[PDB]
Amino acid sequence: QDYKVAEISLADWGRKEIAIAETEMPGLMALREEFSAKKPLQGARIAGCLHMTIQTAVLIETLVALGAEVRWSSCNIFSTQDHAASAIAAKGIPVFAWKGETEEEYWWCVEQTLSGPNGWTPNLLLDDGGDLTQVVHQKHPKLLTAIKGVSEETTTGVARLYEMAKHGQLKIPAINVNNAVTKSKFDNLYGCRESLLDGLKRATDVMIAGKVALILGYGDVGKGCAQALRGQGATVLVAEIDPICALQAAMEGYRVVTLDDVAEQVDIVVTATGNYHVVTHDHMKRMRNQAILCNIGHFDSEIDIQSLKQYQWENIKPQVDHVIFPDGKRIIILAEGRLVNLGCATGHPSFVMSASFTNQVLAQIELFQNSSQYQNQVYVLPKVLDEKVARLHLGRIGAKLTQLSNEQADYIGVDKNGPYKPDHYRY
Amino acid sequence: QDYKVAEISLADWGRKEIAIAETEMPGLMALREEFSAKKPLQGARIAGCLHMTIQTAVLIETLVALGAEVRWSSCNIFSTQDHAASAIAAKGIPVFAWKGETEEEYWWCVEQTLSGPNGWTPNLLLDDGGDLTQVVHQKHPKLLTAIKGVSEETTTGVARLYEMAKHGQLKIPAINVNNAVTKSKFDNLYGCRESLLDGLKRATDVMIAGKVALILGYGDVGKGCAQALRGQGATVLVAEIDPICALQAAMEGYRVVTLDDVAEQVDIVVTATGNYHVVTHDHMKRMRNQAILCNIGHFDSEIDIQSLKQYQWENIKPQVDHVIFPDGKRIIILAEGRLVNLGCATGHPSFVMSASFTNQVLAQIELFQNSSQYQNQVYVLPKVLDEKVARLHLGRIGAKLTQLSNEQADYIGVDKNGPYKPDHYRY
Ligand SMILES: NC(=O)c1ccc[n+]([C@@H]2O[C@H](COP(=O)([O-])OP(=O)(O)OC[C@H]3O[C@@H](n4cnc5c(N)ncnc54)[C@H](O)[C@@H]3O)[C@@H](O)[C@H]2O)c1
Ligand SMILES: NC(=O)c1ccc[n+]([C@@H]2O[C@H](COP(=O)([O-])OP(=O)(O)OC[C@H]3O[C@@H](n4cnc5c(N)ncnc54)[C@H](O)[C@@H]3O)[C@@H](O)[C@H]2O)c1
């Protein structure tokens, strides 16, 4: 068995939910219809490290339908949906992922995607968070020469690529999929606007209405989280280090505050910073009894979980834990500080993951075909492809585009078929 | 009298409202405090073409306090606040602006800023919409050699600059002030979110709640307009030519439709496209009795007002008119299709105009000092100045910034004092 999953017999349940998700993912299904005959990824050998969800299974099978061979692992120890991994494993696709991995099992799973039977080695990386990129660069540099490039899913992974490039550590071309508009401004924002609530509500019977909720970070994710909780009747506080993002939050009616000031006043804390130890031991000590603490940023290091090692952890149910302080006060921590929407729920819904993953497929096609035209730097896909991604998703939600006349295209200086905005337009 | 205004005796009223606006405009007052002693604009001779409002008077006096000599005109025939122009005129600053100019008077006013007593000629342009830039390039090309550059306020003006550059018509450096983040994402969005309602409510006793309102265009302005009307209980429809902006509107719960389809179904139509003849005669013929039609984009050419020339126009009150169709049906048109928030009300509130105009002052300083380092192209101010603008406005609305620790700055790859985002971050 060239796979490792929890229970293979969950495959039929996974297939059923995959069939449903396909009908919510028109971008991926359109790429199959456009490309599955020509097979533009025949000869592609993709090592993938990205949350093994039902939506990711549709990504995997789209890559396969386009001719790729892949080997897959998840980029988080709690984010796998076992029945999704099983459905993929049942198709014969090598996948190494289950919900609740140890850290040792996590890195073993990543390692399994770098080599397969018969001397299989990847010529492409598909990464979400930079761990697979890290492993190849730091531990298998012999693989780097045959890797055409990496396409990277998330903000934290791109930050790691930027730092590698700055220091001359990046040795392959990189496509920043996060900063496709149809990713960052949809997945990160609208996806989290729904899936933060999913994780919070599955984990606890805590009411949102009337609570004081603090969001750390007001980037694309924090913007969605703030919208989510405000709609449900919470008083929403925001912390920011960036004065432009702080001003945006203030102009939406949020008080912009520091956790140092407000730790005693909050019922719910959501870290969305992409940063390190924004919630410290003293904050958690100061938090009220039964306060809820979770992280929706990529790595659990947003919270200094290590400071809680000596307290009793009393498990409530899977991925919901009480940490009991010596004075008897308790806090509720979700998923041990790992990504809450994927640890305590099922991640983003299918429709918005389709926009992200259509971008992923196009990046893989571009790297596989034209990696020779790229240097060892970070790039984004051109705006014409970004607009194509949006176009492919309009029909599902019944949106009808107006067509420019010739004089209207000339008036604003665009082609009738786009692209419709200057390169640095921010939407 | 080196000025032309409506009634100079309104100056004391203008001074009173200017004093109030100063307390809402901390960015401009901070630049006075930082720079009024060193006078970085001593020797600057600015021709300005920008809505002569109370907020613009604070801009003008900030430039003057920094050492500039200016001559001012408005960029719209209805947008001047007569008492603001009078307060400026009373200070001895040459200004040529009144509410309700004819088109001949409008262009005469622009012409007055290009020459003053004693052979005064500008060495800097400050433009909002591109009309002043057009006049200098097309009718006074002798002035171009001594003009250090132009800073441009709005989306439509930047579009005109881009087209000039593409064809080799741009003969001075240009600073795109619109695409400072602290302008486009604040002024265009939050400003219009308030000032569309201002104009609509001052013009008519029309209730928003229960109405079907159509916004043409879902860029920064249309986004604010949609938010405004939705908060007040209207069913909000959106039209778009750009599939990314259409998808954004759909993901906020707006039906994305064409005016060709829905003309008979709408109570209110707001053009926010920056484009040409998006509302045609047939649309207006099809609109219901007492339907309200207005434009919040820069030029009245969004609506083919010319098609209504032969119908009776029955004035309701200043800038509110009935157009009576031969079948007896009437539509209400605001400000003859000119900018509704400035024609039927007073434009954006002071706080957000401060962020825009602080950017304007910094662009003028940069052009005056360093125009030699620029070619005849369009540029934006660097992100460090954009962040400074936001920083200067945080105190007024009580927002408290978190400070990065050293390890946190290193973790995300930024300096503790910024800039905090990559150059192409979209906020
Ligand atoms: N859970 C999900 O489904 C999901 C989806 C996309 C991204 N992410 C992850 O979420 C994180 C945020 O993503 P994003 O796209 O919003 O990034 P972003 O850079 O757009 O937003 C992060 C924000 O955090 C702020 N910040 C940084 N340090 C801070 C501190 N100490 N205190 C307060 N604010 C601070 C920054 O100023 C910035 O505005 C990343 O780790 C990203 O990989 C998660
Ligand atoms: N009233 C104000 O206070 C104010 C403030 C800022 C800008 N403006 C003006 O408003 C206009 C829009 O500014 P913006 O910053 O939102 O620009 P933008 O480019 O961000 O938004 C314009 C949008 O209109 C869409 N569009 C173009 N042609 C269309 C058509 N035929 N049908 C439907 N949609 C169409 C474009 O796709 C785009 O998304 C410009 O003229 C700008 O100068 C007015």
Coordinates of C-alpha atoms and ligand atoms in Angstrom, one line a residue, chain A residues 402-404 408 412 420-421 425, chain B residues 154-157 178 183 187-188 192 195 216-222 239-242 245 272-275 278 296-299 302 339 341-342 348, ligand 2:
Chain A
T402 CA -22.0 43.7 -18.4
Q403 CA -20.1 43.9 -21.7
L404 CA -18.1 47.0 -22.6
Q408 CA -16.5 52.3 -23.3
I412 CA -11.2 53.8 -19.7
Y420 CA -9.7 45.6 -16.9
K421 CA -7.5 47.1 -14.1
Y425 CA -5.1 47.9 -8.5
Chain B
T154 CA -9.0 60.8 -8.5
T155 CA -9.4 57.6 -10.5
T156 CA -10.7 59.3 -13.7
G157 CA -7.7 61.7 -13.7
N178 CA -5.6 58.3 -5.8
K183 CA -6.8 57.7 -0.3
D187 CA -11.9 58.6 0.7
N188 CA -13.3 56.6 -2.3
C192 CA -18.8 57.8 -0.5
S195 CA -21.7 61.2 1.2
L216 CA -23.2 50.7 -11.7
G217 CA -19.6 49.9 -11.0
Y218 CA -18.2 48.0 -7.9
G219 CA -14.8 49.6 -7.6
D220 CA -13.9 51.6 -4.5
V221 CA -16.7 54.1 -4.9
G222 CA -19.4 51.6 -5.8
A239 CA -23.7 46.0 -12.5
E240 CA -20.0 45.3 -13.4
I241 CA -17.9 44.6 -16.5
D242 CA -15.0 43.3 -14.4
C245 CA -15.3 43.0 -8.9
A272 CA -20.1 54.9 -10.2
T273 CA -18.2 53.6 -13.2
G274 CA -15.8 56.3 -14.4
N275 CA -17.1 55.3 -17.9
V278 CA -23.6 53.7 -18.9
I296 CA -21.2 59.8 -8.2
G297 CA -18.4 59.3 -10.7
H298 CA -16.2 62.2 -11.7
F299 CA -17.9 63.3 -15.0
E302 CA -21.7 58.5 -17.3
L339 CA -21.2 64.5 -8.9
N341 CA -22.4 64.0 -3.2
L342 CA -20.8 67.4 -4.0
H348 CA -17.0 63.8 1.9
Ligands
LIG2 N1 -17.9 61.2 -5.7 C1 -16.7 61.1 -5.1 O1 -16.5 61.7 -4.0 C2 -15.6 60.3 -5.7 C3 -14.5 59.9 -5.0 C4 -13.5 59.2 -5.7 C5 -13.7 58.9 -7.0 N2 -14.8 59.3 -7.7 C6 -14.9 59.0 -9.1 O2 -15.8 57.8 -9.2 C7 -15.4 57.0 -10.3 C8 -15.1 55.6 -9.8 O3 -14.0 55.7 -8.9 P1 -13.4 54.3 -8.3 O4 -12.2 54.6 -7.5 O5 -14.5 53.5 -7.7 O6 -12.9 53.6 -9.7 P2 -12.6 52.0 -9.9 O7 -11.9 51.8 -11.2 O8 -12.0 51.5 -8.7 O9 -14.1 51.5 -10.0 C9 -14.9 51.7 -11.3 C10 -15.5 50.4 -11.6 O10 -16.5 50.6 -12.6 C11 -16.5 49.4 -13.4 N3 -17.1 49.7 -14.7 C12 -16.5 50.3 -15.8 N4 -17.3 50.4 -16.8 C13 -18.5 49.9 -16.4 C14 -19.8 49.7 -17.0 N5 -20.0 50.1 -18.3 N6 -20.7 49.1 -16.3 C15 -20.5 48.7 -15.1 N7 -19.4 48.8 -14.4 C16 -18.4 49.4 -15.1 C17 -15.1 48.9 -13.5 O11 -15.0 47.6 -13.8 C18 -14.6 49.2 -12.0 O12 -14.7 48.1 -11.2 C19 -14.3 57.8 -11.0 O13 -14.8 58.6 -12.0 C20 -13.6 58.5 -9.9 O14 -12.9 59.6 -10.3 C21 -15.7 60.0 -7.1

